[PDB]
Amino acid sequence: DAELLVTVRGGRLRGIRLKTPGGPVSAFLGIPFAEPPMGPRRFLPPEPKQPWSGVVDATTFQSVCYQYVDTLYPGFEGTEMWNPNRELSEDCLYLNVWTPYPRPTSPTPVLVWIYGGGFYSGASSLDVYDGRFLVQAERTVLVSMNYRVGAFGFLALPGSREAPGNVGLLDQRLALQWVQENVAAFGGDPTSVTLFGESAGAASVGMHLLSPPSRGLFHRAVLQSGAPNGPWATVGMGEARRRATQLAHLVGCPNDTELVACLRTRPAQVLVNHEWHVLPQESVFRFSFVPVVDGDFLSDTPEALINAGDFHGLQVLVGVVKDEGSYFLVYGAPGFSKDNESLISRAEFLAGVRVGVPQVSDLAAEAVVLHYTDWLHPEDPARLREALSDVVGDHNVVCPVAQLAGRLAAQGARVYAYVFEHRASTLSWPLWMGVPHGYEIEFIFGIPLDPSRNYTAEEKIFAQRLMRYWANFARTGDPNEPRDPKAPQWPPYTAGAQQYVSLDLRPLEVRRGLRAQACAFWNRFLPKLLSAT
Amino acid sequence: DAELLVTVRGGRLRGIRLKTPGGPVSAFLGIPFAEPPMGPRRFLPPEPKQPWSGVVDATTFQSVCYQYVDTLYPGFEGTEMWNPNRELSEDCLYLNVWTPYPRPTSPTPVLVWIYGGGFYSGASSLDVYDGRFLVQAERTVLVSMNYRVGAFGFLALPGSREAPGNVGLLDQRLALQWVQENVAAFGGDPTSVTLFGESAGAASVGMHLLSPPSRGLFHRAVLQSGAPNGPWATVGMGEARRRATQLAHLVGCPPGNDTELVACLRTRPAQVLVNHEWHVLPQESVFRFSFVPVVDGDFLSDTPEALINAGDFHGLQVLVGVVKDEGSYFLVYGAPGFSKDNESLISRAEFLAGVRVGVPQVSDLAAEAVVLHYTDWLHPEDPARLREALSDVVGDHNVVCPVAQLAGRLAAQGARVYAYVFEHRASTLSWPLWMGVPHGYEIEFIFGIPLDPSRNYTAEEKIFAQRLMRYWANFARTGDPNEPRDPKAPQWPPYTAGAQQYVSLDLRPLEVRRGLRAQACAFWNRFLPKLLSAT
Ligand SMILES: CC(=O)N[C@@H]1[C@@H](O)[C@H](O[C@@H]2O[C@H](CO)[C@H](O)[C@H](O[C@]3(C(=O)O)C[C@H](O)[C@@H](NC(C)=O)[C@H]([C@H](O)[C@H](O)CO)O3)[C@H]2O)[C@@H](CO)O[C@H]1O
Ligand SMILES: *[C@@H]1O[C@H](CO[C@@H]2O[C@@H](C)[C@@H](O)[C@@H](O)[C@@H]2O)[C@@H](O[C@@H]2O[C@H](CO)[C@@H](O)[C@H](O)[C@H]2NC(C)=O)[C@H](O)[C@H]1NC(C)=O
Ligand SMILES: *[C@@H]1O[C@H](CO[C@@H]2O[C@@H](C)[C@@H](O)[C@@H](O)[C@@H]2O)[C@@H](O[C@@H]2O[C@H](CO)[C@@H](O)[C@H](O)[C@H]2NC(C)=O)[C@H](O)[C@H]1NC(C)=O
Ligand SMILES: *[C@@H]1O[C@H](CO)[C@@H](O[C@@H]2O[C@H](CO)[C@@H](O)[C@H](O)[C@H]2NC(C)=O)[C@H](O)[C@H]1NC(C)=O
Ligand SMILES: C[N+](C)(C)CC(=O)N/N=C/c1ccccn1
Ligand SMILES: C[N+](C)(C)CC(=O)N/N=C/c1ccccn1
Ligand SMILES: [Cl-]
Ligand SMILES: [Cl-]
Ligand SMILES: [Cl-]
Ligand SMILES: [Cl-]
Ligand SMILES: [Cl-]
Ligand SMILES: [Cl-]
Ligand SMILES: [Cl-]
Ligand SMILES: [Cl-]
Ligand SMILES: [Cl-]
Ligand SMILES: [Cl-]
Ligand SMILES: [Cl-]
Ligand SMILES: [Cl-]
Ligand SMILES: [Cl-]
Ligand SMILES: [Cl-]
Ligand SMILES: [Cl-]
Ligand SMILES: [Cl-]
Ligand SMILES: [Cl-]
Ligand SMILES: [Cl-]
Ligand SMILES: [Cl-]
Ligand SMILES: [Cl-]
Ligand SMILES: [Cl-]
Ligand SMILES: [Cl-]
Ligand SMILES: [Cl-]
Ligand SMILES: [Cl-]
Ligand SMILES: [Cl-]
Ligand SMILES: [Cl-]
Ligand SMILES: [Cl-]
Ligand SMILES: [Cl-]
Ligand SMILES: [Cl-]
Ligand SMILES: [Cl-]
Ligand SMILES: [Cl-]
Ligand SMILES: [Cl-]
Ligand SMILES: [Cl-]
Ligand SMILES: [Cl-]
Ligand SMILES: [Cl-]
Ligand SMILES: [Cl-]
Ligand SMILES: [Mg+2]
Ligand SMILES: [Mg+2]
Ligand SMILES: [Mg+2]
Ligand SMILES: [Mg+2]
Ligand SMILES: [Mg+2]
Ligand SMILES: [Mg+2]
Ligand SMILES: [Mg+2]
Ligand SMILES: [Mg+2]
Ligand SMILES: [Mg+2]
Ligand SMILES: [Mg+2]
Ligand SMILES: [Mg+2]
Ligand SMILES: [Mg+2]
Ligand SMILES: [Zn+2]
Ligand SMILES: [Zn+2]
Ligand SMILES: [Zn+2]
Ligand SMILES: [Zn+2]
DSSP states (O other): OGGGGEEETTEEEEEEEEESSSSSSEEEEEEEEEEEEOOOGTSSSSOOOOSSEEEOBSSSSSOBBOOOOOSTTTTTTTHHHTTOOBOOSSOOOOEEEESSOOOOOOOOEEEEEESSSSTOOTTTGGGGGGGGHHHHHHOEEEEEEEEEOOOHHHHTTTTOOOOOOOOOHHHHHHHHHHHHHHGGGTTTTEEEEEEEEEEEHHHHHHHHHHHOOOOTTOEEEEEEEEOSSSTTTTTHHHHHHHHHHHHHHHOOOHHHHHHHHHHSSSHHHHHHHGGGGSSSSOSSOOOSOOBOOOOOSOOOOOOHHHHOOTTTTTTEEEEEETTTTTHHHHHHTTTOOTSSSSOOOOHHHHHHHHHSSSSOOOOHHHHHHHHHHHHTTTTTTHHHHHHHHHHHHHIIIIIHHHHHHHHHHHTTTTTEEEEEOOTTTTTTGGGGGGGGTTTTTHHHHGGGTTTSSSSOOHHHHHHHHHHHHHHHHHHHHHOSSOOOOOOOOOOOOOOOTTEHHHHHHHSOEEEEOSSHHHHHHIIIHHHHHHHHH | OGEEEHHHHHEEEEOEEEEEOOOOEEEEEEOOOOOOOOOTTTTOOOOOOOOOOSEOOOOOOOOOOOOOOSSSTTTTTHHHHHOOOOOBOOOOOEEEEESSSSSSSSEEEEEEEEETTTTTOOTTTTTTGGGGGHHHHHHOOOEEEOOOHHHHOOOOTOOOSSSSSHHHHHHHHHHHHHHHHHHHGGTEEEEEEEEETHHHHHHHHHHHHSSSSTTTTEEEEEEEETTTTSSSBBBBBBHHHHHHHHHHHHTTOOOOOHHHHHHHHHSSSSSHHHHTTTSSSSOOOSSOSOOOOBOSSSSSSHHHHHHSSSSOOOOOEEEEEEEEEESSHHTTTTTOOTTTOOOOOOOOHHHHHHHHHHHSSOHHHHHHHHHHSSTTTTSSSOHHHHOOOOOHHHHHHIIIIIHHHHHHHHHHHHOOOEEEEOOOTTOOOOGGGGSSTTTTHHHHHHGGGGOOSSSSSOOOHHHHHHHHHHHHHHHHHHOOOOOOTSSSSSSOOOOOOOTEEEEEESSOOOEEESSHHHHHHHHIIHHHHHHHHOO
């Protein structure tokens, strides 16, 4: 019917009606937003999609951008839920729109979701990103886009116009430009556009906040388990060159314009098969192709722009999960497995510190180890495992997020912080991993409401609470209800009081400090030490 | 009384009967154990006392070695109890013996006490060091001696033969030699001598373990709130020369150069040297007094930390401990914003400054490590927290962690080690409540001072003091502070490098706990060295 037929600036779309226990939602899946970045357009900033004849079929998710498909635990849902669920294609720059079925006659606010995956993986078609429940429950419009990952999104020869860098970020910015122009055709309000994302998606949200050409395309920002100032999310120019020139040597590619032309002649699968082999430490925490500090998108290091920005007028929702680090340990760290209790040894632990804190001196590593050993039980394997889980989690997610949250708060922003502390009753990982990196998203998106998944009565209620908080924030920059007794339940995060809430089944609880003591080491002392040595 | 006339290798002594509530003790006070270190003998090692004719009057304490007198809180009980209580004289090398009234029939173990005072102060004649109550209640023999402090005991021009250094420690060794030769006259057993000391006396006891010629003179060791590997307890030969010649400059002594310089210092009156001792290294408090034991390669063949890691320690029984609030007393002596008369609610600015006072001579980066370690990053402005924090910084750095280091290294090489944390604040205690259990305030209880009728301690406190006297007396008799065949009480398990068990001493029964600030002392004993040498 005419509810599923929409015309945007480029032409006609035909969407699909999706069902929700609450009721139906109108969905437009796989709307092209850039000309396919293929052949000579590989590694280049995206070009806007030109108008098309006829009716585009937006009834299903388009393709996934090329990436390594994880095969650590084959057939295991804990890993499979995150793997690509469409064909891989360099023809992948498509976005998706969910909107209420009585299409809003008034302009409703817009959530835009940027998926994470450490800049080396990810897809908007993953099942845990289904916008239908968030839309049907809170009557906002939800948009999500694909953006190039891996070398396709982030190979850079700083200097050249052929491989400029950060084109995966520009993919996102283009889709936000698209939202500006077309969201109103679906009921959306271009003037209330809230960015949210997790992991590299959250780091992405962070860079749009620091990149002036993007700061005009959205108004509020949610960062979940990621920060642009994290040790894994940017790379220098001179290093970006070495990594590009190395991938080229690996793929058999004999100046800069000549380098890119050879890479462009290689099947996309050949680049994916070598991009992990670029760095000797084949680590998840220093993946080869991430955003570059070139002076373009980022006029300075993310740290530099944070410490110097006026963030008056910005509201920000920010948080981590309880155990950020445990998911990364099974992907590398020596002694670990989803299939036993991963009872690490001291030397396995000393070794793991180097894998999760890569590229720090020897003195810095000893500092980490002395800082995180329990000197009354120096060789307890369980305690050691938890310690290492904290070392990588604190260093890569928590202390970066914290450092950003306080700086934003201190320099004019209005911040609300959380820690996600619910372990799903469906969670297929082992119990020692706890609440792992990535496992709040199911709840933000209202997945427990899907009748076919097997979540708890109490868990559906929790997901609705969370959706309420997020939509509240989208609407007003304030997750609290505009009208309620005992009204300031969720207080703002400030550099002093450092209040956050804990999100779980029990009613909101305020706590002080996001690993305040731990993050003093990472944000304040460790740099001084890397310096004077 | 036949018990008060006693004869010693040097000659005859007349002693005095002292009263305890529980009964008499006979005491010999101010026995000359060395020829007086005067004029030409100033700064030299001690010569043994030439023997005398007649009866030495050993019925009253002799003089106190020259030293700074504390003018900080005039009249105040808390400071005055430590101040010299006899005339200051360079003629001060005498020792004291308390022995049970009916002199013991069989050879009883001997406790030798070495007083503290950070090597710039102290005297065996102070009231809290009265042996009578311990000797009456446990029937051991007790000895204490005076040793030279300040520049008179520790000024060194390494290589001089004029000022060889460590003569204050030689003073103590001379008295231990005297005990070996003479305590038999008082019913004491020279084959069962236990040293015990506090503060710089505990550091002294430690250096005696590390100096072979002293190991023949005792068999067990108790170290209370002090250790020879503390940052304040020793000095290099090169630093020792700077400080010696800087003092010579402050007194007007043109600097053979070593022999002129010392002969000049000898002419200056003793009080003039005391006056400038602290101005050799001006500082705000009490850490790093400038005339301490020197690592000369004679008395201390190597640094204490070297001597500890490879030493002859198997079979040694050691008793070792700290007070609950080791830091707070030092802060009162010059940490910015500290007095005994207000709550010492310091600002962050004074906290940062106080870190450099209590942890002197460390790099700017090292000091930042300290701050970032002891700050409470949830309440970094809270003045009360900052106050306790800085107390722990200086308490950990100067006392607790050096003692924890010594304990585990002894235990590792096969010493039998027993560790305590004294955590009872005397109901009499005159210092303010926020200093808690300050440095030096277990001594009163070890010595049974609560038994003294004039001082009104509690009954709970008297039975406690008797409990402590028994622990220490048990230890002196048998190298084990536990009630021999009595496991009706909780056992005091020995300290090992793995489990790290110690007992809390207070008015409640023995409580066994693990780890002497294990987390804190990793920083001080392991990381901070690496940091300081790698940068
Ligand atoms: C008691 C008795 O029967 N005879 C003693 C006699 O043994 C003693 O001589 C001293 O014995 C001690 C034993 O512990 C040392 O071995 C002395 O050698 C040293 C020392 O190591 O202490 C050598 C040291 O280099 C000297 N230091 C200097 C010169 O700076 C000291 C110094 O003489 C001190 O006076 C000792 O405390 O001695 C050994 O000489 C003598 C006193 O020395 O007394 C007898 O009665
Ligand atoms: C716990 O498991 C890890 C991972 O090994 C996997 O899971 C086990 C249950 C077992 O079935 C293995 O075959 C699996 O591959 C163990 O770490 C591995 O140990 C082997 C020893 O032969 C070694 O070759 C591997 O490299 C190790 N893997 C890593 C990542 O280091 C570990 O030994 C198991 N046991 C304990 C006590 O942790
Ligand atoms: C708590 O007391 C200290 C003690 O210092 C003072 O000592 C005397 C010289 C006299 O000024 C008394 O009133 C005090 O007891 C205070 O620290 C001093 O503060 C004054 C000025 O306020 C300053 O001139 C001194 O240098 C300070 N001493 C230092 C830095 O060591 C402290 O301010 C008191 N706190 C209060 C009153 O809240
Ligand atoms: C790298 O070398 C290539 C050669 O493959 C250079 O390409 C030139 O491009 C211009 C375009 O106007 C041609 O007219 C030339 O004939 C090409 N070949 C040359 C100059 O040898 C390219 O300019 C070089 N890249 C640089 C200098 O950045
Ligand atoms: C967890 N999820 C399955 C949603 C994908 C993801 O987030 N993978 N994480 C990569 C990474 C690596 C280093 C630092 C941060 N993120
Ligand atoms: C008088 N009292 C019992 C407190 C003796 C004492 O302990 N005086 N202080 C010594 C000191 C100084 C610096 C470092 C270590 N100890
Ligand atoms: Cl368009
Ligand atoms: Cl469906
Ligand atoms: Cl048409
Ligand atoms: Cl606007
Ligand atoms: Cl642009
Ligand atoms: Cl950065
Ligand atoms: Cl870099
Ligand atoms: Cl570089
Ligand atoms: Cl290949
Ligand atoms: Cl491969
Ligand atoms: Cl791989
Ligand atoms: Cl937690
Ligand atoms: Cl290095
Ligand atoms: Cl345990
Ligand atoms: Cl505001
Ligand atoms: Cl149910
Ligand atoms: Cl904290
Ligand atoms: Cl005499
Ligand atoms: Cl002379
Ligand atoms: Cl006389
Ligand atoms: Cl005199
Ligand atoms: Cl021995
Ligand atoms: Cl030297
Ligand atoms: Cl030197
Ligand atoms: Cl000379
Ligand atoms: Cl040392
Ligand atoms: Cl303690
Ligand atoms: Cl410096
Ligand atoms: Cl730290
Ligand atoms: Cl505060
Ligand atoms: Cl607290
Ligand atoms: Cl043994
Ligand atoms: Cl008081
Ligand atoms: Cl024996
Ligand atoms: Cl305990
Ligand atoms: Cl501890
Ligand atoms: Mg992977
Ligand atoms: Mg190959
Ligand atoms: Mg090769
Ligand atoms: Mg254990
Ligand atoms: Mg006289
Ligand atoms: Mg005289
Ligand atoms: Mg010399
Ligand atoms: Mg030196
Ligand atoms: Mg001058
Ligand atoms: Mg003067
Ligand atoms: Mg335990
Ligand atoms: Mg501790
Ligand atoms: Zn991630
Ligand atoms: Zn591979
Ligand atoms: Zn540390
Ligand atoms: Zn002392």
